[PDB]
Structures are given as structure tokens and as C-alpha cells.
């Protein structure tokens, strides 16, 4: 009973501006895997996932997107450069680290999935075994079957002042760390892993484009190519030696991103343009886009910080006009300079409250107003000279 | 319960001279970490490292800033050279070291640490050891339970006995590596150190400037940029896997330093910039500058000179001249030859005590005083011939 | 309790001709090693190494100073070539194999250090294992207290009828290979060995300047300073990974060894500039620094050689003289082919002594003497030709 693609994409809402089609795109594939165990023996072998290339500039979505979908399917992520094997032709490394990096990152997960699912159970029975080192009425019976049987009475009144109340904590978290082992089975939780990575794993490839052709010369485009055929198993379906066993890639989904400014994705090798079904463009992000990354979002940055200040009793309230300067300082650096997407507003924003986050503790209890005059006051000489927006911006 | 910036800035005049923006700058990513705790838990997720770039030429503080803000915050802190990953494109080593090398040094002192916070106690309870094995004095019950309850009497005398006074001394010392051991929780310990790099890790990266770009060529470019691409997750979040455990980098604190001469912060990738929201610059240093930075610094060089002097029961005594024509020496050879900043200093000072500290056990008694004389009898004719210099200096 | 400067020179001059200044440099190093221990917390870890360069030519004592020194400080010592990383553009090996492979050698030496400072407890309790099977009054008492109580007399006077006399013998090495190991805590040890690396360290490095630049070509210096780059976080301050444990690179001393023809200290990586703060210069030995080296240091060639000669019952005399004809012949080949320093003396001594050497045996109990005749006849000839020079010399 999953979500449905409308469904996911709204949940993408919430945290990535604009980029609809990639999100239809991202949510298609998520969905199908639903509807895939939803079939046949037979046909549930033959159905594949329906892997993507996502197509676009730097920093406007993309990763966010796939990080973002992973985190919605609760299914296991990793990210990974393609280049990072065209360097095989000196040692470099090999692509099934991908599934064996991705294993083990779904391992770290199912881990700590289980042990946090555990941690206020093994505290429960921690003190079960702190209130029985204070009043020990153990074994069968006791006293009465009815009335004085509930021995709690005084371990009752003995607990709670121990609650709110060697060593009773120094104790605890020794037995939560006695308790909580002594209730994990490693077992099963070595297949956990391995289940999600073969039914949930998803696998996205940055700098596919930069594994592409060009005229550029032999040698260069057999290290690239390479890293392509080194590729084909891992999508086409193969199995994977896993340092905690034996995976078989035939349903990780994959996505992979390109700028394809220099490269088309015609120029893939053609066993992969038939792995990559999916095609999708992403756009350059606009001033305004900016404005509202800055602040809807529901984590946004403007949010984050906000929350950070609290932190400090400092109240912080962003003007609109306050925020617009923000996100034009952002884009005319970019343009001015180089131009690195939205990542340029974590940037800019940062330059920006430098004397505040500094200050912070001190004006405790006050309240500032980031308008569009402070701002101003801090941005508009850095982002004007440029030189020295390429060092601080 | 952290400082103001204020006070920040204020511990770190105390060890650098100048340089005010950047202590200002660092002070306020420190402040901030305090604030983030002070939210609510969403936008304590939301709230990142306010990260800096340094833009400043060689020796003049910024190394000293960062080196100083850890302490000061008792960070674990750890410097790298960002060139040392574009030889990666021949063997190099990985990125991801950094936060393992970084956890390895973090875990060496939560150790070194808690040994320390613990070596005392360890040494009390050793006593009771051996005070035991003199005599058990008192015990559960034995004599009175009031005036000849207390045992201590003639275990006093002999614990004193002992202080003052197999082999006790040796049997102890044995003891004390065998209590202390006995007191501490190798688990808690791994994750002490584990919470303190996730929480205050501070992570200096020098060179950054000499990662970025120019047409020079494509092959030294793409290496180049390899090292700012595989450093965005550890700026961006993520997870590493280390030899202790794993760390999430989302939170350590991370400050690059350039000179930025030749390439601009603008030529850093964008996914970069955006996570440099601080920039700041260092001013190169004048003999003024130096002069304070020869005798100002609560443990500066001179400062040092002389109580190693008095280890040997020598009197050494600066005089103003004498610093100030000191200063002079280090800024002419920076000048006529190599300007490599402060560090000219401590050779310049350390040739000019040559004699006086290899004499100074058979000066033992005596009051020396290094004064404008002194200093110009023994560098000026180095000062003066540059060949000399650049071997001599 | 360490010796000073002048001691640690004299001892040095015990088996080093010349090279006075190396001498007072390597020196100066250990001093501070003191000199460091002799502070405050605070201090103790902002002083590091004073790492030294040594520059001169082939074979005129660099090395052999390094090693007497570490000798001296009964410090673990190790010798790698700077070349052998550059290999690693191919596939080479690892910088961090230098304080792998010298905590290996530190562990080699802890080891043969305690089991050997052990061999002869281990034989005497041996032999109260053999003087037990043999005269077994074990057990509490058995006679008389006093006169009757020691029980040695006969045992007494059997031990030694068998220590000056299955199998004893056979029996006690078997037993001495059971006691010892019953003996031996390989815990502490495999800790000793590291804090012995980590505070008595001492790594030389040859061929520092085959490591720099030139205007070779791009590839060729990619290589060379990418070793130097890999070398910043040793002498800098890292932490390794250890087959025996985790190792901080920080306090181990460097004594780095160019010839720099080719190359200047100033070409090195301005990192490692920084890091290598002492530079020292050694000259080519004469003629007249040939002779000494032939007889004055205490365990010197020729008298190793009249040593091996009277193992064999042939007492060996060196003719003044006859040393000066050596030396020159050494001087002689070195200038007319190559110069290899030193080295020359021993392939000139041994090819002079080969005769001898193998009559040796047949003239047990002669009076054999290296005079100036001798050594003409055997050496003028080869010497002259220079073809014959360049196999035979």
C-alpha cells in the first residue's frame, strides 16, 4: 500500500522547488516498483526497473530529488561519481564497490533503524533490572494471590523516585548497553540489508556525460567507455560479492544525471541508452526560484537558521524584500562569475549572518530583522567586486 | 554556556596579534553551534556549519586562528593540504581520510583526556591498595563503632609513611595502569569521540586555492577539480565509515584556507562557493606586527626563549631595541629574499641565541641581556648577505 | 637523565670521522627530545621535532650519523628511499608503509630486546626444573626449620656436577623455550613498541631532492612531488594504521639526505621546507679523512679485520704506511672512475686481503704485516687500470 505518483511527487514538493518533471519522472519509477510485486511469478522476473538520466545544469535538483525519493521509500541511497573509475587505468577502483558500498551503507541503516527501534525498550527493562537490585520479591509468590501479590507498592513509589530522581544512571545505561545487544539478532539483520539493497536500493550515478566519447583521442575515451561497459552488469543484472553477502543487482533502481553540454546521451554506450528508458531535462534555477528555496521548503536554510539562532534566544525574522536581495546576490554573483546554482544561496547566506551567528549568545533575548537594508549593507560590496567573489562567494 | 564572540575574539587576542575580521569571522561559527543546540528540533536539522574561506598570504595567522578557535572550543581539530588529493590521479589517497584522520586524532584525545581525568583517583584508590596490603586496618566492624571504629591511626602513618617515602613505588605504578584501565568504558570512550567529531569536529583545509582552474590545461584541471568535487559530501553531509565507527560530517565545522593570488574564490566549483557562505581576509603582516608577535603573545617565542633559559638558571632579558631591530632582521630577509611571513621570526630569533643557548649551563647564574647591540653583533652581516640568508635564515 | 650536545657529539665521533656540524646538528635533535619532556602540558605539544637536511655527497657519513644516533638513543631506526613513492604512478607503494615498516622494526627490536634481557633468568629457573627432577623435596618443610630445612646439600653439588657437566642438556633449552614465552607479556609489548616510534622515532629519508622538480616535464614532477605531498601529514603531524596498532607520526624526528646538484632545498614543496627547519651541509672526505676511517673508529675496518684474522690464529699488523697506500688507492679509483666515498675503502681493503683471507687457516699462529709493499704489489696494478678498475675496485 504504497503512495501513489501524485502522492509522491507532493511529498517531493516539500522539499525541492520546481523540477516537476523530474519529480513525475523519480515518482514513476518508485511507483512501478509497487506495481511490480503486485504481479504474476512470471512476470515479476521480467519487469525491470525503469532507470533514468536526468538531464541538466549544476545544482538545480537533481540529486536532491533522487536523495530525497530514496528517503521517502525509506529505501536504501548512495550516491557515486562516474569518473571516479576512468581512473581504474592506474589503479582507481571497481564499479561493484557501488553495490558493495551501497551495501554497507545499508547495513549502517537497518542497524540503526533496529537499534533506535529498541533503545526505549531496553531503557524500560534497564530499570526493571535497577528496581530489582533495590527490592528483590523475585521467584513465584510470595505473599497473597490477589491483594498482596501486586508486590509494586513500595517498588512502585522506589522507581519513580529513581525516574525523576554503581550509580542508578551510571548503572542504566550500563544495562541499556547490556540490554539492547542481548535483544539484537545479527542474523537475520545480515539478510535485512541485503533484502532492501536487491528490492529497494537505489543507485545514482553523477557525471555520467563525463563517461562519454569525443573525438578527444583513444586512449581517454577506452578509460571512459570502460567504466560504461563496467557498468552494463550492475544495470543489465548481475550478482555483486558482498563483504556481508551476496547481492544481486537486478532491481536496484538507477539514476543517472548529466549536464550532456558537451556530450549527448546519444553518445552512451548503446547498452546503456537501453538500461536509461527514462529521459528528463531539469532547468536553470531562476531569481525567483531562488527566493523560494530560500524560505518554502519546510526545512529551508532561512528555517534552519532561524531555528540555530533560537538556539542562542535570538529572535530572527527574514523581510521579503530582506530575502529577495539575498537571492538576487546569489544570482549575480553566479552570472558575474561562475554560475553553481542554488548551492551559491548556502553561500551567500552564510557571508551574511557571519556577524550575527558571532554575536548571537550575546544579544540573547533580542530581536533582529534581517531586511532588505542589512543585507544590503552586508552583501552588495562583495558580490560587486568580483575578484573577491571568487574567493569569499 | 558557551563565550560571546566577543569573548571568543577576546581568548583568541590572547595568542594572535591582528588579524581581527578572521577571529571575528571563526568567532561567530563557534557562537553558532551554541545557538543551533538552543532550537527546536526541527531546525536544529535545518541549521548548518556557517564554513569559511580564509583568503590571506602565508604565515600570518590563519593556520594559528583555526588552531586556537579548536582549542578554545576544545574541538577535535585536524589540517590538510588540499593538493595532496589531485595526486590521487596517480595512486593519492581518498578525501574520506580526512574525517577517519580526524576521528583517529579525535579518539587519541577523548583518551589522553580521560586518562588524565582519571589518573588522580586512580592514584587515591592505588593508595588504598597498598595501605591494604600494610596493614587492613579498620574493616566491618573490628573494635568500637565510634572512638575505636576508625582504623586510620596507624594506616595514616603509614599511608603518610609512604607518599613521602614488586617495590611499592613500582608495584603502584602497576596499579595505576591497572585501576585506571579497571575505571574506563572502552565502548563510551569509541563513542565519545565519535559524538565530539559529529559535534565540534573542525576540519582546516590549506591549498584550497590550488584546486581551482586556469586554462592551463585539461588534464591538471579535471584532477584539480576532483579534489573540490570529492570534498562537497563532507561539506555537503554525509556519512564516513571509520575505523571506530561511523561519523555523520553534516555538522563539523570546516574553514579552507587560500592564498588566492594566481585562481579566485569565484574559480572554486559552485557547489563550493555555496557552502563558503564566510569569506574573509587576512592582512599581510608589518614589523610592527611583529615586534608585538615576538613578545605580546601569552606564550610567545621570547616568552618561551626565556623560561628555557631559566630551566638552565639563566636570566635572559629582551630589550625593546633589541625586539624591534629582532622584527626588523625577520622583515628585511622576507624582503630582500622569500616573505614567508611570522615563521621568519622564530629562525631569525633562534639563530641570534645560538651561542647563548648552547652556553648557557656554564652561564648558569648569570643575567644576560639580549639588547639592540646584541642582536645587530649577530645578524645583521647574515641579514645583509642574501645568499647567506636563504641558507642561514 | 640524557646526555648533552658535546656528549651525544663525542659519542658520534667514536665511530664517525669528521662531519663535525652533522654531528652538532643530529645532536641538537636528540637534545630537544629532553629539552621537551622538561615541559609543561600546554608546551609539550606545540614543540616538535626540529627535522633536519642533511646535503652532501655520496658515502661520507649521512647515514651512518643518522644511525649511530638513533643507536645512541637506543631509538628505533629505519631508512627509506624517497624514489621508491614515485613508482606509485604505477603501482609502487605507500608513504604510510615508512611508519609501518619502522614500527615493525620497532617491534623486531622490543621483542629481541626484553626476550634477550630474559635468557638468563629463564636458565637458571630452568635449571630448578632440572634440579627438581632430579632431587624433588618439594612442598612446605619436609625436615627441620633450621639446620635440617635447607635442603640444598645434595642438590647443591648435583646442580653443578650437571650445569659443568631427554637429556639435561637437551632437556633444559627445551625447557628454556617454555619458561621464557611463560615469561614474556606480549600485551605491554605490543604497546611498547609504539610508544617507542611515537616518542623515539627516527625515520631517514634518502634522495629527498630526486624528489623535486626541474623543467623535466610535467608528468615526471607530478610524480616526484606528489611523494612530497604524501610525505606533509608524516612530518606534519598524522596518525597511521599499524598491523600492532595506531601510530601519531608526531614526534618522530626526520633527518631527510640530498646531494642537491641538480636540485636546491628551495625546489622542495614549500610544506616540507617549512617542516625541515635545519639544513646542514657535509663535505667529501680527503685522503688524509680516508686514513682515519681505515683505523681511528673503535670497531673500524681494519680492525674488524684483524679480529676475523685471529679468530683464525693469524695476527694481522697495519704498516702506517700501509694504511696511507690503502686510503690513496681508494682516493686513486674514486677520481679516475667514480667517487662512491668510503664505500671505496672496503672493496680496496677486501680485495688487498683476499690472499690472506684465504690462507688464513694454513697460517695459523704467523705474524702477518700489511706494510706499504704489500699493498703496492696488490693494489697498484688494478688501481692503474682503469677498465679492470671499474669491475674489480
Not at 541485503?194 to 528490492?199: F, M, R, S
Not at 552564510?350 to 544590503?376: F, P, W
Request: aromatic fraction near 4%; proline fraction near 4%.
Amino acid at each position: 500500500s504504497e503512495m501513489t505518483p501524485r502522492e509522491i511527487v507532493s511529498e517531493l514538493d516539500k522539499h525541492i522547488i520546481g523540477q516537476d518533471n523530474a519529480k513525475r519522472s523519480v515518482a514513476i519509477a518508485l511507483r512501478n516498483r509497487w506495481r511490480r510485486m503486485q504481479l504474476n511469478e512470471e512476470l515479476r522476473h521480467e519487469v525491470t526497473p525503469k532507470n533514468i538520466l536526468m538531464i541538466g545544469p549544476t545544482g538545480v535538483g537533481k540529486t536532491e530529488i533522487a536523495r530525497r525519493l530514496a528517503k521517502l521509500a525509506n529505501a536504501p541511497f548512495i550516491k557515486v561519481e562516474a569518473t571516479k573509475f576512468t581512473e581504474v587505468g592506474y589503479v582507481g577502483k571497481e564499479v561493484d564497490s557501488i553495490i558493495r558500498d551501497l551495501t554497507d551503507a545499508a547495513v549502517k541503516m537497518v542497524r540503526v533503524q533496529a537499534i533506535e527501534k529498541n533503545r526505549y525498550r531496553a531503557e524500560e527493562l534497564a530499570e526493571e533490572r535497577i528496581l530489582d537490585v533495590l527490592i528483590p520479591p523475585a521467584k513465584n509468590n510470595w505473599g497473597q494471590t490477589e491483594q498482596q501479590q501486586e508486590p509494586s507498592a513500595a517498588r512502585q513509589a522506589f522507581r519513580k523516585k529513581l525516574r525523576e530522581g554503581l550509580k542508578i544512571k551510571d548503572a542504566m545505561k550500563l544495562l541499556i548497553e547490556e540490554e539492547a545487544a542481548k535483544l539484537v539478532n545479527p542474523e537475520e539483520l545480515k539478510q535485512d540489508a541485503i533484502d532492501a539493497v536487491e528490492q529497494h536500493g537505489i543507485v545514482f550515478i553523477d557525471e555520467i556525460d563525463k563517461i562519454c566519447k569525443r573525438g578527444e583521442s583513444s586512449g581517454p575515451d577506452v578509460s571512459r567507455e570502460g567504466v560504461q561497459r563496467d557498468l552494463l552488469p550492475l544495470v543489465e543484472g548481475c550478482t555483486v560479492s558482498t563483504k556481508h553477502g551476496m547481492v544481486k543487482t537486478d532491481h536496484i533502481l538507477f539514476i543517472a544525471s548529466g549536464a550532456f553540454q558537451i556530450a549527448k546521451p546519444s553518445d552512451l554506450i548503446p547498452e546503456l541508452q537501453g538500461r536509461l528508458p527514462i529521459r528528463v531535462e531539469l532547468q536553470a534555477l531562476t531569481t525567483s526560484d531562488f527566493e523560494r528555496i530560500l524560505t518554502e521548503p519546510n526545512a529551508s536554510i532561512t528555517v534552519q537558521y532561524k531555528a540555530l539562532m533560537a538556539t542562542e534566544g535570538v529572535n530572527i525574522e527574514f523581510t521579503d524584500s530582506g530575502i529577495k536581495r539575498i537571492a538576487e546576490a546569489a544570482w549575480q554573483v553566479n552570472e558575474s562569475t561562475e554560475n553553481i546554482g542554488a548551492r551559491r544561496l548556502h553561500t551567500v547566506l552564510e557571508r551574511l549572518m557571519e556577524e550575527i551567528s558571532y554575536d548571537a549568545s550575546d544579544l540573547s533575548g533580542q530581536n533582529i530583522t534581517i531586511d532588505a537594508d542589512y543585507v544590503s549593507k552586508h552583501l552588495d560590496a562583495l558580490v560587486a567586486d568580483e575578484d573577491l567573489s571568487r574567493f569569499i562567494l
